[PDB]
Enzyme design. Structure first.
Site, short mmCIF file in Angstrom:
data_model
loop_
_atom_site.label_atom_id
_atom_site.label_comp_id
_atom_site.label_asym_id
_atom_site.label_seq_id
_atom_site.Cartn_x
_atom_site.Cartn_y
_atom_site.Cartn_z
N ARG A 52 8.26 -1.35 2.34
CA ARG A 52 8.20 -2.37 1.34
C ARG A 52 8.83 -1.82 0.20
O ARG A 52 8.19 -1.32 -0.60
CB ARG A 52 6.57 -2.71 1.53
CG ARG A 52 6.44 -3.70 0.22
CD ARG A 52 5.19 -4.50 0.38
NE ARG A 52 4.35 -4.63 -0.74
CZ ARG A 52 3.07 -4.46 -0.59
NH1 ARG A 52 2.46 -4.22 0.66
NH2 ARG A 52 2.20 -4.70 -1.44
N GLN A 60 7.88 0.87 -1.91
CA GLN A 60 6.74 1.53 -1.17
C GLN A 60 6.79 2.25 0.29
O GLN A 60 7.83 1.74 0.92
CB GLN A 60 5.71 0.46 -0.87
CG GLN A 60 4.26 1.08 -0.54
CD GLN A 60 3.26 0.10 -0.41
OE1 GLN A 60 3.08 -0.79 -1.14
NE2 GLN A 60 2.02 0.19 0.24
N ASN A 99 -2.98 2.42 -2.33
CA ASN A 99 -4.46 2.61 -2.07
C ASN A 99 -4.87 1.26 -1.47
O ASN A 99 -4.40 0.31 -1.83
CB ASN A 99 -5.22 3.19 -2.99
CG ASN A 99 -5.54 2.54 -4.38
OD1 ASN A 99 -5.94 1.19 -4.13
ND2 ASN A 99 -5.06 2.77 -5.57
N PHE A 110 4.28 4.47 -3.90
CA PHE A 110 5.11 4.00 -4.50
C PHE A 110 6.07 4.36 -5.64
O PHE A 110 5.40 5.32 -6.63
CB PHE A 110 4.78 2.35 -4.90
CG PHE A 110 3.70 2.14 -5.94
CD1 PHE A 110 3.78 1.97 -7.22
CD2 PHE A 110 2.46 1.85 -5.26
CE1 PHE A 110 2.74 1.53 -8.12
CE2 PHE A 110 1.41 1.78 -6.50
CZ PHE A 110 1.85 1.45 -7.49
#
Length: 161
Positions: A52, A60, A99, A110
């Site tokens: 992502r 991420q 998290n 990230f």
């Protein structure tokens, strides 16, 4: 510690990103990441996707069990506590822990591409990019508003300098 990523988009090589870890501010968080880069525990980030990518926000990754955001684990067993929040998201090019709320650190992380003050005190900052910020930029431009990627972006090889 300085660790690195060799990144590839659909089998094609982009470049190497180099990171310095704040091993004297967040020793347990920096150690998780270091050990996952080298794969010395028999598991780690090599072969894992950037699942992502949100342009003008962050990249991420770190889910090396399932590859979609639902997995990964730390070197301490399962999730671990937030170590501290002394470093802030005050500049682009920072490494910070993903998290699921307080004290649920595993392996996901990230890379910021903008200051993110609203994440201060929620996510543990543990490193920054020292080389290859331009490959972070190439990866970023492969993402979309939704986080979905236009290519299969993999951390093909990782290690420690």
């Amino acid at each position: 510690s300085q660790v690195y990523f060799d990144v590839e988009a659909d089998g094609q090589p982009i470049g190497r990103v180099v990171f310095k870890l704040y091993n004297d501010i967040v020793p347990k968080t920096a150690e998780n990441f270091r050990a996952l880069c080298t794969g010395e525990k028999g598991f780690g980030y090599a072969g894992s996707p950037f699942h992502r990518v949100i342009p003008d926000f962050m990249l991420q990754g770190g889910d090396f069990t399932a590859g979609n955001g639902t997995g990964g684990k730390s070197i301490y067993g399962g999730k671990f506590p937030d170590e501290n929040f002394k470093k802030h998201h005050d500049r682009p090019g920072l490494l910070s822990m993903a998290n699921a709320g307080p004290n649920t650190n595993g392996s996901q992380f990230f890379i910021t591409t903008v200051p993110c003050p609203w994440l201060d005190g929620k996510h543990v900052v543990f490193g920054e990019v020292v080389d290859g910020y331009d490959i972070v930029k190439k990866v970023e431009s492969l993402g979309s508003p939704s986080g979905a990627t236009k290519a299969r972006i993999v951390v093909a090889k990782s290690g420690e300098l």
